[PDB]
Amino acid sequence: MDTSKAVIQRFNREVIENGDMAAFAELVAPDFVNHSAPPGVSPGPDGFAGFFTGMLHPALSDIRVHIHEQIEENGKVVTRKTIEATHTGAFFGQPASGKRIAIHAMDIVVVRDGKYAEHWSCADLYGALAQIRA
Amino acid sequence: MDTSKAVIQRFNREVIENGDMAAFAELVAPDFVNHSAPPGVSPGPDGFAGFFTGMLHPALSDIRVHIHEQIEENGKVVTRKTIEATHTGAFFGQPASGKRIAIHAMDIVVVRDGKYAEHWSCADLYGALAQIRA
Ligand SMILES: [Cl-]
Numbered sequence: 001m002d003t004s005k006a007v008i009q010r011f012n013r014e015v016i017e018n019g020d021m022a023a024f025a026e027l028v029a030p031d032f033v034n035h036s037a038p039p040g041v042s043p044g045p046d047g048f049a050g051f052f053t054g055m056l057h058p059a060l061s062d063i064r065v066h067i068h069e070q071i072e073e074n075g076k077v078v079t080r081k082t083i084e085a086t087h088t089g090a091f092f093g094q095p096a097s098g099k100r101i102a103i104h105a106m107d108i109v110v111v112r113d114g115k116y117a118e119h120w121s122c123a124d125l126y127g128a129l130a131q132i133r134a
Numbered sequence: 135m136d137t138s139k140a141v142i143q144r145f146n147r148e149v150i151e152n153g154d155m156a157a158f159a160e161l162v163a164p165d166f167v168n169h170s171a172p173p174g175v176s177p178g179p180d181g182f183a184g185f186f187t188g189m190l191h192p193a194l195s196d197i198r199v200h201i202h203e204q205i206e207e208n209g210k211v212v213t214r215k216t217i218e219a220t221h222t223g224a225f226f227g228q229p230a231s232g233k234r235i236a237i238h239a240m241d242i243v244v245v246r247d248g249k250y251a252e253h254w255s256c257a258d259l260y261g262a263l264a265q266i267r268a
Contacts, residue, residue, distance in 0.1 A: 071212050071242065073205040078212040080242060080254060092260070106240045106256045108205065108214060120214060122240045126226070126259035 004077045004111035005070045011109075011116065012065040016083065019057045024049055029115040036121040048119070060085035062100075077109050083123075087132055092125060094132045101131040138211045138245035139204045145243075145250065146199040146215070153191045158183055163249040170255040182253070194219035196234075212242050217257075221266055226259060228266045235265040 002010075007027060014023035028045045037043040042050070057063075066082040083103040089096050103123055110118035136144075141161065148157035162179045171177040175184070191197075198218040205212040217237040222230050237257055244252035 069210070069242070071205055071207040071210050073207055076203070076205050078205050078240075078242070104256065106212075106242075108203075108212075108240075122238065122256040122258065124256060124259075126263070129260070 002114075004075065004109070005072060007111045007114055007116075008070065008077055008079055008107075008109050009067060012067060012079070012081065015052060016056070016065050017063045019052065019063075021049060021053060024052070027115055029112060029117050032116050032119070034119045034121075036119065059087070059089040059091035061088040062086050075110055075112075077111065079107050079109065081105055081107075091132065092129060094129055097132045099132060099134075101128055103128045136248070138206060138209070138243070141245045141248055141250075142204065142211055142213055142241075142243050143201060146201060146213075149186060150190070150199050150217070151197045153186065153197075155183060155187060158186070161249055163246060163251050166250050166252070168253045168255075170253065179250075182250075193221070193223040193225040195222040196220050209246075210242055210244055212240065214240050225266065226263060228263055231266050233266060233268075235262055237262045 011027045014020045015027065028048060030045060032045040032048065034043045034048045037047055041047045063083060063085040066084060067079060068082065069080040071078040083105055085101065087097045087099045087101055104127065105121065105123040107122070108120040109116055145161045148154045149161065162182065164179060166179040166182065168177045168182045171181055175181045196219060200216040200218060202214045202216065217239055218234065220234045221228070221232060224230070237259070238261065239255065239257040241256070242254040243250055
């Protein structure tokens with residue numbers, strides 16, 4: 001039986017790095033809520049999947065997620081990480097630059113019965129677009 | 135002798151909201167390191183104080199720090215918060231708009247002997263500048 005931290009590590013590897021949506025289905029609960037979802041997006045699992053399949057993986061190639069630290073209290077796991085990838089597609093209105101960039105992020109995940117139940121995210125887009133524009 | 139969560143709560147109220155640098159001197163250690171310090175800035179307490187006195191408080195008036203949650207493990211405290219303020223000064227290339235904006239942020243603080251010892255930050259500047267431009 002693997003830990004909440006282990007489940008988040010598996011999600012970052014199989015879903016964010018590899019883009020395995022079969023792994024997504026296995027690691028995200030049907031009652032999942034993305035509290036950080038923008039006002040126009042579905043806070044549900046389908047909205048969350050749509051961010052990876054429709055936005056992230058079309059924009060970023062050769063994704064490497066560097067998990068620096070994981071702080072856990074009361075079933076919530078804070079992951080401080082870096083998303084390193086090659087900018088090969090339009091990202092936040094920025095056309096493909098071919099540049100390898102590093103996005104600093106922090107997410108808070110609530111894992112229940114081996115699946116993602118609740119999620120909050122924070123990312124340095126200002127800095128990532130600055131990298132793209134240099 | 136108050137908790138790490140209470141020290142961070144006091145720092146956000148007296149330093150970030152009120153701009154009391156006398157409180158800064160009392161709540162930040164001399165060996166403090168800001169791991170999220172920009173490339174040209176000092177990771178030291180002097181560099182960190184300079185962010186508030188030199189860029190944050192000249193840019194933002196009537197600051198309100200809305201602390202949502204605090205997750206602690208192994209001497210690290212993650213604070214998920216929303217900085218609400220009026221844009222009255224120069225902020226990341228945007229001249230004063232007079233708008234009251236909300237900056238979503240997350241910081242990881244290591245409190246040692248009632249003072250700030252280590253710090254990591256994440257803030258939604260992309261979102262904040264978007265608000266300034268609306
Ligand atoms: Cl994520």
